[PDB]
Amino acid sequence: ESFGLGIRGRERFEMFRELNEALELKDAQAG
Amino acid sequence: ESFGLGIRGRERFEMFRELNEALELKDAQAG
Amino acid sequence: ESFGLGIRGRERFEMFRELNEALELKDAQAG
């Protein structure tokens, strides 16, 4: 289940980008 | 310009979703 | 309800600081 989040901001998208990569890292630490 | 973030997380996407809507409101206040 | 956080990051804290302010604005609009 994917969700498309269209944004017209490089700064905003940058945040969600760093937050998304950081969340994925936590998963690797668990398993 | 214009960046689409395809997140497969209801929780994570929920955060960026609320952050995107809240960020758009600030832009309206400016000007 | 009021918790405190000890962050020594001007940029990081600045981000969460903007969210808190923008969050309070959403309550005024309600919707």
Next chain:
Amino acid sequence: ESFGLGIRGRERFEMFRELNEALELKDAQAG
């Protein structure tokens, strides 16, 4: 100088809290 955050939301602080803790982990990795 340190910057305290006074949020009136357990959920909100959780986000900013998980971000600060998750962002600090990245430093340990470095590149």
